[PDB]
Design a protein around this motif. Structure first.
Motif, short mmCIF file in Angstrom:
data_model
loop_
_atom_site.label_atom_id
_atom_site.label_comp_id
_atom_site.label_asym_id
_atom_site.label_seq_id
_atom_site.Cartn_x
_atom_site.Cartn_y
_atom_site.Cartn_z
N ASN A 83 32.73 5.00 24.26
CA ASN A 83 31.71 4.52 25.18
C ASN A 83 32.16 3.23 25.85
O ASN A 83 33.13 2.59 25.44
N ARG A 84 31.45 2.85 26.91
CA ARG A 84 31.80 1.64 27.66
C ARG A 84 30.53 0.97 28.16
O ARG A 84 29.59 1.65 28.57
N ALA B 124 16.70 3.46 26.09
CA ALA B 124 17.91 3.69 25.33
C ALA B 124 19.06 2.81 25.79
O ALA B 124 20.19 2.98 25.31
N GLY B 125 18.80 1.89 26.72
CA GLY B 125 19.76 0.88 27.13
C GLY B 125 19.34 -0.49 26.63
O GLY B 125 18.30 -0.68 26.01
N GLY B 126 20.18 -1.48 26.93
CA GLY B 126 19.88 -2.81 26.43
C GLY B 126 20.91 -3.83 26.86
O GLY B 126 21.78 -3.56 27.70
N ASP C 287 24.09 1.35 28.43
CA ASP C 287 23.22 2.50 28.63
C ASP C 287 23.63 3.60 27.66
O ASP C 287 24.71 3.56 27.07
N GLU C 288 22.75 4.59 27.50
CA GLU C 288 23.08 5.76 26.69
C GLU C 288 24.39 6.36 27.19
O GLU C 288 24.62 6.41 28.41
N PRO C 289 25.29 6.80 26.30
CA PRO C 289 25.10 6.90 24.84
C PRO C 289 25.68 5.76 24.04
O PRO C 289 25.80 5.89 22.82
N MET C 290 26.06 4.66 24.69
CA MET C 290 26.51 3.52 23.91
C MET C 290 25.35 3.01 23.08
O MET C 290 24.20 2.98 23.53
N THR C 291 25.66 2.61 21.82
CA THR C 291 24.63 2.18 20.89
C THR C 291 24.49 0.67 20.94
O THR C 291 25.41 -0.04 21.36
#
Length: 130
Positions: A17-18, A88-90, A106-110
């Motif tokens: 992810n990025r 689901a973002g942050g 953003d999704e799908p990064m946790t």
């Protein structure tokens, strides 16, 4: 270059992810480096962030605004890390000696992946005296 910290160490791959965007700002609000899609942060937004580091509870009642986008404040670390959530973002904001390191995901990064990249770079900068 401050830009190399963003390009190589915040916008890098993490478990596939990025981050969507990232930046390093002076504690005066000036942009020292940023990715293309990093928003324009308003002076009052920067002021609320700086205040929340030294006075926890400043941002929670109003939410965290970044370029007009509202994030709900979640668990952070006093005078060290501010974290916000938007669905689901942050966002993670890490305070260094001289600067503030931002990552927006953003999704799908946790959240854990964003925290790792932002906080690890911030800790590297602190060791440099930055």
């Amino acid at each position: 270059s401050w830009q190399t910290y963003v390009d190589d160490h915040l916008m890098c791959d993490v478990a596939g992810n990025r981050l969507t965007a990232a930046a390093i700002l002076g504690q005066d609000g000036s942009v020292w480096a940023q990715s293309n899609n990093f928003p324009q942060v308003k002076p009052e937004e920067i002021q609320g962030i700086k205040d929340d580091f030294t006075t926890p509870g400043t941002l929670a009642p109003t939410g965290l605004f970044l370029g007009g986008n509202k994030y709900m404040v979640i668990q952070g670390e006093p005078n060290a890390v501010i974290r916000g959530k938007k669905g689901a973002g942050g966002v993670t904001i890490k305070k260094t000696t001289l600067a503030l390191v931002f990552g927006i995901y953003d999704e799908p990064m946790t959240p854990g992946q964003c925290n790792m990249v932002v906080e690890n770079l911030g800790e590297y900068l602190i060791e440099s005296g930055l």
